């Protein structure tokens, strides 16, 4: 890994990083991938599914090793946040997310990027680009809330992740999704209804339009 | 029923009151007799225990008021049970037994003895 900081290409570097992050604990060393950290951080344009692969590799860091590579994790966070921020406003002609039409495709992407938060400890801050990217996702879903829910595959699976984020801003979007659903009169299985009711209880949101729907559905 | 449309509900949920029934041990680390006069407390286990004295049982189900239906394994398990366990005593709930001599298949069995005899009767009437 020492020589591959300059004798490797970005695609090969990220593929090797993914392979190493997928390996078991007993054959993982920090110093090996600490160099790949600054090797793969540099990039210009990368496909959405490939950056999703990088997010998956970021997830796959073993938990005891995780505190050791916190700085590399933060640098990767900054890079991927900048890339997703540039990617959201790109048109669908170049694969950008603003020209997308479906609900599964996005929920496969913002779900990974939002679950990516659970890496840094609670007593630590978050990268500025990461927070701005979360804000960008919130705006991108609030601008087209109506078509996402009306799909045959509703996006409700993304609801918990936004509520997992300490960021309050995300709670407004999470509540807005179920608000539009209540104004749409959808039906849910009883387990999902109870889960949403518990989520209402924990974060003590004070919306009234969804209160009637939750009461009738419970 | 259609309004359930496959929703398991709270009966099939994973509530803490459901794992209590699971007394397995948590080891591996994850033709039919109509019987009346029983007590509603009488479990199906006690039902099988009492009426297996006559013959083996595949299915059995209780109803409110002591009415219950039991399906036998073989016709011999029935031919003995229809007349042996009548008015026997169990848990202060002396049983009274009736047997559905007509079956969902035996009705079609009776259809032909009905119709050929009807043809004979018609021949008699014509003559």
């Amino acid at each position: 890994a020492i020589r591959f900081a300059e004798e490797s290409d970005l695609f090969s570097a990220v593929q090797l990083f993914s392979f190493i992050c997928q390996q078991e604990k007993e054959a993982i060393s920090p110093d090996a991938v600490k160099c790949l950290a600054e090797r793969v951080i540099e990039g210009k344009d990368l496909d959405q599914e490939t950056v999703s692969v990088l997010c998956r590799a970021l997830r796959s860091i073993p938990r005891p090793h995780r505190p050791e590579l916190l700085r590399e994790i933060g640098e990767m966070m900054e890079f991927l946040g900048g890339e997703v921020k540039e990617l959201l406003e790109l048109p669908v002609a170049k694969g950008g997310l603003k020209g997308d039409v479906s609900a599964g495709d996005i929920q496969s992407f913002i779900s990974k990027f939002l679950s990516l938060d659970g890496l840094l400890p609670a007593d630590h801050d978050r990268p500025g680009t990461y927070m701005a990217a979360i804000v960008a996702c919130v705006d991108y879903i609030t601008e087209r809330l109506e078509d996402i829910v009306s799909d045959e595959n509703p996006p409700f699976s993304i609801i918990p992740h936004l509520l997992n984020i300490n960021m309050e801003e995300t709670r407004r979007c999470g509540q807005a999704i179920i608000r539009e659903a209540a104004e749409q009169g959808i039906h849910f299985p009883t387990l999902q209804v109870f889960r949403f009711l518990l989520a209402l209880g924990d974060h003590n949101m004070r919306d009234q339009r969804v209160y009637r729907h939750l009461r009738n559905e419970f | 029923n259609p309004w359930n449309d496959g929703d398991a509900g709270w009966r099939g949920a994973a509530t803490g009151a459901r794992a209590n029934r699971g007394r397995g041990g948590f080891r591996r680390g994850r033709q039919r007799v109509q019987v009346s006069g029983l007590s509603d407390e009488t479990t199906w286990h006690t039902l099988k225990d009492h009426l297996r004295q006559a013959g083996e049982v595949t299915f059995c189900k209780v109803f409110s008021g002591g009415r219950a239906v039991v399906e036998f394994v073989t016709p011999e398990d029935a031919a003995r049970a229809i007349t042996e366990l009548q008015a026997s005593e169990l848990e202060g709930a002396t049983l009274f037994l009736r047997e559905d001599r007509e079956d969902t298949v035996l009705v079609n069995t009776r259809r032909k003895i009905r119709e050929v005899r009807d043809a004979q009767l018609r021949a008699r009437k014509e003559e």
Partner: protein
Amino acid sequence: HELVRVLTAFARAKIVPPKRFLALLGRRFAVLNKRKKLGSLPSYRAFVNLYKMGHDQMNTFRFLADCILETIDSNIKAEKKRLRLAQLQSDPHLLQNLRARERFKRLTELKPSMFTKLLLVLARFGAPH
């Protein structure tokens, strides 16, 4: 109402529908319902249509039933509001039956002979009473 008209014309021609397409229309009914509330009579029209070409998706029926109940509830609440505001200011058998019939028609916008079949089908579905 255009989609309800589409449904009743399709029923008039007695075609064999692509049931998935009907379910998609039923789902979009609630999308359009936000702009303008669907009437009780059009909603029951759609109910009897989707009944008579063998639709079995439940949720489409549930939305229409809840819409009809919502219309009835809103009418009753408006009547009670009027009576409360009035409070805040401070053969003979036919003679009796005319008031009941007019109140029924004013409230649910439908005959009893057809309300009593909507309740019949809802009971048939096994909905919680």
